[PDB]
Structure 1
Amino acid sequence: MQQLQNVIESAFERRADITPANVDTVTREAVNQVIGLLDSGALRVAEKIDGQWVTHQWLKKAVLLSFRINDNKVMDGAETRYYDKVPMKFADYDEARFQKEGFRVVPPATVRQGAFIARNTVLMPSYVNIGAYVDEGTMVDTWATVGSCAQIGKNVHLSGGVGIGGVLEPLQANPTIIEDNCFIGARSEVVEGVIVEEGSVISMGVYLGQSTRIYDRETGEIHYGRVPAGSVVVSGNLPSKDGSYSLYCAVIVKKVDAKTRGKVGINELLRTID
């Protein structure tokens, strides 16, 4: 949408000098419009086109600017109080709306406005930050986090305490992406724009960033930045040249098979009852 993109790209250049007081109504209204569209899933920060994920840098820009244009407001918790500038997505939902949108939200799961949550998902107590997109069938297990602008595929299981990297701080070029049908094991973390290709199974306590060596013991091939579709990855180490010590790495031990599927399947009984 040019009328919106234009204003966004002009404002971004003046980011440092914009404040909630000096911002003109045009930039304010535009940024706000863009956040509502992300919130509804009409727009998304990254999308797959021709077998490639592309990032719309200007939607990322809008997310950033929202922090320069909005002022903080006291939010009343019950026993306590908060002071922040991004509204809560569900603050205004009624049963009819929850009923139509079709996902389950377990207290105290919290989602910021500007994040899209699809039908048939289950959010256990967890956090979904602004700009993120969580597709159909996915479960975000306890204390997991979906970082700003992150893209999560359909039928994905993000285990307890798992973290998917954001793009706000530290600042990142690209969002982190988890394709369809992946299983991410407990306490693992995927950051810095790494792409976990569809049907992959990441074991527990695996840490993937751009500097992480993803070693394929079968081919000897070492990857960086992505997990090839259908891999089973676990933690390991690679020895130094003198064998004096070893350093952490992720190892692709095999391709997903029946034995693997037996341990990571989604439970449909917990999904939306049509």
Structure 2
Amino acid sequence: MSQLSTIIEQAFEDRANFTAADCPSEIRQAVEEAIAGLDNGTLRVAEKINGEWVVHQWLKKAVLLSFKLNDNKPIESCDLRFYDKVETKFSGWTEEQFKAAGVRVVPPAVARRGSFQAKNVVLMPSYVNIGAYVDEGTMVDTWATVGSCAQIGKNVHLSGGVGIGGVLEPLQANPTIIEDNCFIGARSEIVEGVIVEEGSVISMGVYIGQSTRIYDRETGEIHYGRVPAGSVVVPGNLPSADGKYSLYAAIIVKKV
């Protein structure tokens, strides 16, 4: 026997009749124990039983009651704790070190130690993983990611939400490379060691890994792994031979 489910079920049906202030402590204690059990994994909102996923509605009700029963409170940075084996790049950097490096680090942007950012780089809130190199004058916009070992050239614009995929393995593969003077538009993804050559304009919504067809609409040639210099690329599709569907492709629409 466990009374948690029944107590939470009853309180949720009764929820219009109490508030956070006058909540009886047994309901309050039951909600806490439900939250603690969700937190240590001894309870879970849904689980697979006899081959089928089953939802436990009373645990959803516990989550909802925990919102009802707790007021907003100040939360400080000290309440965030982490645990990892790679140091962050700027811990214990002085103001002199920051000024000498010439990089703007907009909170809450983080770079890992073992990555490099040249002078006049701006890191909006974003992530730069270990082994990456970001050259002079480059803008890394909000929630962008410069993945492990990626090489970002000079005067590059990585727009918001852009992901530059990391490459460690295989050891012989080139990392993902964005050459000088490229524009990568919002929520685009360049991964798996693809190279975008110099002076290209990649619009928003463009996904390119090693399997993406890069269709030059002027020549008809399908390229892989490399955007030729000066390409303007937008998202598109290529038709199937039967005409019943089409598949995503990156379309080179002009060469500038």
Alpha-carbon distance in 1 for matches of 2:129, 2:170: 15
Alpha-carbon distance in 2 for matches of 1:175, 1:168: 7
Say yes or no: does 1:212 pair with 2:212.
Answer: yes
Alpha-carbon distance in 2 for matches of 1:167, 1:219: 31
- Structure 1 residue 221, shift from structure 2 partner: 1.2
| Structure 1 outlier segments of 4+, above 4 Å | 168-172
Greater gyration radius: 2
Alpha-carbon distance in 1 for matches of 2:172, 2:110: 23
Partner deviation per Cα, 1:76-129 (whole Å, 9 max, x = no partner): x52121010000110021111111111111000000000011001100000000
Say yes or no: does 1:164 pair with 2:164.
Answer: yes
Alpha-carbon distance in 2 for matches of 1:105, 1:237: 38
Aligned equivalent of 1:129: 129
Partner deviation per Cα, 1:192-238 (whole Å, 9 max, x = no partner): 11000000000011000011100001011111010000010000001
Q: What RMSD, in angstroms, separates the aligned Cα atoms of the two structures?
A: 1.7
User: Which amino acid in 2 is paired with 1:141?
Assistant: D
Q: State how 1:28-107 maps to structure 2 within 5 Å.
A: 78-107=78-107
Partner deviation per Cα, 1:167-213 (whole Å, 9 max, x = no partner): 24899833100000000000000001100000000001100001110
User: Which amino acid in 1 is paired with 2:93?
Assistant: Y
SS at match of 1:137: coil
User: Which amino acid in 1 is paired with 2:191?
Assistant: V
Alpha-carbon distance in 2 for matches of 1:191, 1:162: 11
TM-score after normalising by structure 1: 0.64
Structure 2 unaligned blocks of 5 or more: 1-76
Partner deviation per Cα, 1:226-259 (whole Å, 9 max, x = no partner): 0000010000001000101100000000123xxx
Q: Quick check: which one's helix share is greater?
A: 1
Q: Which moved more, 1:172-181 or 1:243-252?
A: 172-181
SS at match of 1:161: coil
SS at match of 1:127: strand
User: Which amino acid in 1 is paired with 2:151?
Assistant: Q
User: Which amino acid in 2 is paired with 1:85?
Assistant: K
Conserved 8 A contact 2:168-2:175: no
User: Which amino acid in 2 is paired with 1:115?
Assistant: S
Aligned equivalent of 1:188: 188
Q: 1:234 to 1:172 in 2, by over 3 A?
A: farther
SS at match of 1:192: coil
Structure 1 unaligned blocks of 5 or more: 1-76, 257-274
Aligned equivalent of 2:252: 252
Conserved 8 A contact 1:172-1:193: no
Conserved 8 A contact 2:130-2:148: yes
User: Which amino acid in 2 is paired with 1:90?
Assistant: F
Alpha-carbon distance in 1 for matches of 2:127, 2:170: 18
| Count of matched residue positions in the alignment of Structure 1 and Structure 2 | 181
Q: 1:173 to 1:155 in 2, by over 3 A?
A: same
Partner deviation per Cα, 1:23-80 (whole Å, 9 max, x = no partner): xxxxxxxxxxxxxxxxxxxxxxxxxxxxxxxxxxxxxxxxxxxxxxxxxxxxxx5212
TM-score after normalising by structure 2: 0.68
Q: Percent of pairs identical after alignment?
A: 83
Conserved 8 A contact 1:172-1:192: no
